Design a protein around this nucleic acid. Structure first.
Length: 423
DNA sequence: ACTTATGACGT
DNA sequence: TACGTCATG
């Protein structure tokens, strides 16, 4: 029934904003955003506080337009180094959180602000120590139970939260709830503690989803935000999916989800239940069909990968429109700038994480191409040397220039290090 | 003129 | 390999 595992998805609420708010107290509890590259239209927003979201301010919005929506908005700019955005501060804060999470359970870093947590073993241990012990509501002070309450206090959201938690707990206590339900509940108690440790030790608040797999846990995470956690049980899946737009499910937010909607003639996740697996496999392929068939039933098997460390390290800069690189010197100079930041990051990785990158991947985008990458070429990464890496990167891609000039001018340079080896 | 990074799959 | 494409933060 896909109830074997307990899995959490933890997400740092507007993480870059929190990092800035911790460092500059004046920014706390105010409509706030983090921007990069202020010159063009105030710069683009990459993180927005909840106070600012109320005004309709979103990420990937220009700061000048954001100010139109929210006149009182406070802006924090990303550190700029070597002519590009420098995210070191956020990566460092990110590592702080992952270390704390690591003490409680097995974690998979999903991005800079999120991680999956496999709590199956952790739950098993707690159960033995806590045998025969009722689970107080006091253990779950920020937990919402999806689908509850069912059946004056309720007008307030905290009123709703309490009643749902009480019905849920009373039903476990009674013996009405299944064994996987108890596992999730203990998982949630563990996550409350993990979240309390994170805030105490970093000052950072975060939301979490708790469920039996990654898709459900990620879904649950978004249900009650910010600074709250949501338990989605197997039993809640039918009602939850019944009105749940397909594009909301992890991995269905793009072309596949669109074609599932377009080919099937449906809009909600639960509608997928009417199709046989073979029907779904014939439309979308063996793997996707199988995965769809199981997912609409709340079943998903992707494991939480024990991996706190990124598999690749990289940096990129965009040169949109008129700023597109059109000279040899410009291309070399920017490759150098990128290779310089890469070196610093690689060396830090080497001393901290006891591994070295062995392959250098160069990606570029040319003017007139919509695709994220127009071209990708690799070469050996023998020495963590910015001048060598930059020069090697040039060698592999120089043949791309059709015709001291460069054309078609590049709208993108990307350097990425891959294939890490223990040492 | 939404920028900057990652992880994973198909071939 | 792109080595290239998809999906997401």
């Amino acid at each position: 029934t896909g109830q074997d595992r307990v899995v959490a998805l933890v997400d740092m609420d507007c993480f870059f904003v929190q990092v800035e708010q911790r460092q500059n107290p004046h920014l706390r509890n105010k409509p706030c955003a983090v921007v990069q590259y202020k010159s063009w239209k105030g710069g683009g927003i990459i993180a927005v506080s909840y106070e600012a979201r109320a005004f309709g301010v979103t990420r990937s919005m220009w700061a000048d337009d954001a100010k139109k929506l929210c006149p009182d908005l406070l802006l924090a700019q990303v550190r700029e180094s070597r002519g590009k955005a420098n995210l070191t501060k956020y990566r460092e804060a990110s590592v702080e959180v992952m270390e704390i999470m690591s003490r409680f359970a097995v974690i998979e870093r999903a991005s800079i602000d999120e991680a999956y947590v496999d709590l199956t073993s952790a739950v098993q241990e707690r159960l033995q120590k806590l045998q025969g012990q009722p689970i107080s509501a006091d253990l779950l002070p920020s937990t919402y139970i999806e689908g509850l309450p069912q059946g004056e206090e309720t007008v307030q959201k905290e009123g709703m939260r309490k009643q749902g938690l009480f019905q849920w707990l009373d039903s476990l206590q009674i013996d009405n709830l299944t064994s996987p339900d108890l596992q999730l509940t203990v998982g949630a108690v563990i996550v409350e503690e993990m979240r309390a440790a994170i805030e105490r030790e970093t000052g950072f608040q975060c939301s979490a989803g708790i469920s039996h797999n990654k898709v459900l846990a990620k879904l649950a995470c978004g249900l009650n935000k910010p600074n709250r956690q949501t338990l989605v049980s197997h039993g809640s899946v039918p009602q939850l999916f019944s009105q749940m737009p397909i594009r909301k499910i992890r991995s269905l937010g793009g072309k596949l989800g669109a074609s599932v909607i377009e080919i099937l003639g449906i809009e909600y996740m639960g509608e997928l239940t009417q199709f046989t697996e073979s029907q779904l496999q014939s439309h979308f392929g063996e793997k996707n069909g199988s995965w769809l068939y199981a997912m609409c039933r709340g079943i998903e098997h992707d494991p939480v990968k024990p991996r706190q460390l990124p598999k690749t390290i990289g940096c990129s800069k965009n040169f949109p429109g008129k700023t597109a690189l059109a000279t040899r010197e410009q291309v070399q100079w920017w490759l150098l700038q990128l290779a310089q930041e890469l070196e610093e990051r690689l060396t830090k990785d080497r001393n901290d994480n006891d591994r070295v990158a062995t392959q250098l991947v160069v990606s570029i985008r040319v003017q007139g191409d919509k695709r994220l990458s127009s071209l990708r070429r690799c070469c050996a990464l023998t020495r963590y040397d910015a001048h060598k890496m930059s020069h090697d990167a040039f060698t592999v891609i120089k043949n791309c220039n059709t015709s001291t000039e460069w054309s078609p001018p590049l709208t993108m340079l990307f350097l990425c290090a891959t294939k890490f080896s223990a040492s």
